[PDB]
């Protein structure tokens, strides 16, 4: 038995990450170090560069730090950056400046990678010359996907061929090549990106784009009888935004003001009612689309997900094996 699974979703939704969990779970670290340092550099310069362009502009809480700012910006476009020990000191100095931090809290108003906070919180760890990336470091390291990639693995002597594709608008033209003869589709969605917009144009709401992309896949003429497993990914960041209270969901999706938690809903132990409500609301916007057309030709299987948690993925992928083998997929 050999099942071919295809990973689909908008850019930065977490597809490539889901695959890394399959390696860590069922299947040259030094090469990833340079990538982690690139995420670290890209993060500090993105936050600093957005300080003057926001409305209202964010001010540094320390004059001294302006010099570190000039430093950071001067080495922004450098091709081969050797990462001197000065670089980490300056970056760390800025990341401690409240002005910089306040600007970070308004990162939904500009384009910033998801691993910003993670890598910046451990600059002292990454700067060491004897530094060895952890599992969590590799799962966070972001690197855009371009073209198709095919992974192989086994679970109880059952074969899985996974396909990872680019999620950005341009890269999508390639998806088609994997459509014929697919067992199931895993559609990933960044549940937490409701207060954000896509990189491609800097206007379209990230969640909306996801919704559109899903409706396009669900009603595709070539995927009429292909079931879709839906990962409502980035659950961790969703809960954090919800509880924080700053960015209100109902300001991006007015329909949320009428939404109430369903009865059959199952919260996690000790889960806040507010959180429960948000994640379920998002789930229903996706289910609402899948319910409009299909007729039992193909089904939709929701799943609350958090790709960077090797533990949550182990669990959910097991729910997935059940879905596949069971329904005769």
């Amino acid at each position: 038995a050999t099942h071919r699974l295809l990973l689909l979703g908008a850019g930065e939704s977490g597809k490539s990450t889901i695959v890394k969990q399959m390696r860590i779970l069922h299947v040259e670290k030094a090469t990833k170090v340079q990538d982690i340092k690139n995420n670290l550099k890209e993060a500090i310069e993105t936050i600093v560069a957005a300080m003057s362009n926001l409305v209202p502009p964010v001010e540094l809480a320390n004059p001294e730090n302006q010099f570190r700012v000039d430093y950071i910006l001067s080495v922004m476009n450098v091709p081969d950056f050797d990462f001197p020990p000065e670089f980490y000191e300056h970056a760390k100095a800025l990341w401690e400046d409240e002005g910089v931090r306040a600007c970070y809290e308004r990162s939904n108003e500009y384009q910033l990678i998801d691993c910003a906070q993670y890598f910046l919180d451990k600059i002292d760890v990454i700067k060491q010359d004897d530094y060895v990336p952890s599992d969590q470091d590799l799962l966070r390291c972001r690197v855009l996907t371009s073209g198709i990639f095919e992974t192989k693995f086994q679970v109880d002597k059952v074969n899985f061929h996974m396909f990872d594709v680019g999620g950005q608008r341009d890269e999508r033209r390639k998806w088609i090549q994997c459509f014929n003869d697919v067992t199931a589709i895993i559609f990933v969605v960044a549940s937490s990106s409701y207060n954000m917009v896509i990189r491609e144009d800097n206007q379209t709401n990230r969640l909306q784009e996801a919704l559109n992309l899903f409706k396009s896949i669900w009603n595709n003429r070539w995927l009429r009888t292909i079931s879709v497993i839906l990962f409502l990914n980035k659950q961790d960041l969703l809960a954090e935004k919800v509880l924080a209270g700053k960015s209100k969901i109902e300001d991006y999706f007015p329909e949320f003001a009428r939404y109430t938690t369903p009865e059959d809903a199952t919260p996690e132990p000790g889960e806040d009612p507010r959180v429960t409500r948000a994640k379920y609301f998002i789930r229903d916007e996706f289910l609402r689309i899948s319910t409009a057309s299909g007729d039992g030709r193909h089904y939709c299987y929701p799943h609350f997900t958090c790709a960077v948690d090797t533990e949550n993925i182990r669990r959910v992928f097991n729910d997935c094996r059940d879905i596949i083998q069971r329904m005769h997929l």
Partner: protein, 189 residues
């Protein structure tokens, strides 16, 4: 199934021959359509006979472009020789037809060897055809060829087992595709 059934099958180790009339548009601009079709039919029917002998299978005619392949339908080892032989007969045919017709008929031949996907497309007016980068290259070798000569690629030469004396083709000078892709060419004697 949501994708139409596709009638296509892959085939490795095959050879492709492209032959095209030189300045065909110019030619049709001076002699009557009736007269042109006859000169063209005189030449292409003669080609279809040669193909049967040489074990080459004619694909299709695109006005003045004529192509066929060896290694189809059933695989063959003598494959690259068949096409070289086919071109040999073709170049000679054209001469005899040019002789008795009085029309300026000249063709460029191009050969390359490799893989191809072959079959049919669509639902109406089926016609067997070939598709692949190797086929794309073959077509470019004809464009890069020289009048009355059999232009071939290095990949093809490695199948001739050295039964033909060739000379530098210099295809990279005559065709931009050949150059950019770094193709090493040769002209048969």
């Amino acid at each position: 199934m949501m994708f139409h059934k596709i009638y296509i099958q892959k085939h490795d180790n095959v050879s492709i021959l492209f032959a095209d009339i030189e300045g065909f548009t110019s030619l049709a601009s001076q002699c009557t359509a009736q007269e042109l079709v006859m000169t063209l039919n005189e030449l292409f029917a003669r080609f279809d006979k040669l193909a049967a002998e040489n074990h080459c299978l004619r694909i299709k005619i695109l006005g003045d472009c004529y192509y066929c392949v060896s290694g189809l339908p059933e695989a063959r080892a003598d494959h690259a020789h068949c096409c070289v032989e086919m071109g040999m007969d073709m170049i000679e045919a054209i001469s005899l037809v040019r002789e008795m017709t009085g029309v300026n008929v000249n063709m460029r031949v191009g050969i390359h060897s490799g893989r191809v996907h072959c079959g049919v497309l669509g639902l109406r007016k089926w016609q067997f055809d070939v598709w692949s980068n190797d086929v794309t290259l073959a077509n470019h070798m004809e464009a890069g060829g020289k009048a009355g000569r059999i232009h071939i690629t290095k990949a093809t030469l490695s199948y001739l087992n050295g039964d033909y004396e060739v000379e530098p083709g210099c295809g990279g000078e005559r065709n931009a595709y050949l150059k950019e892709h770094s193709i090493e060419t040769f002209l048969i004697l």
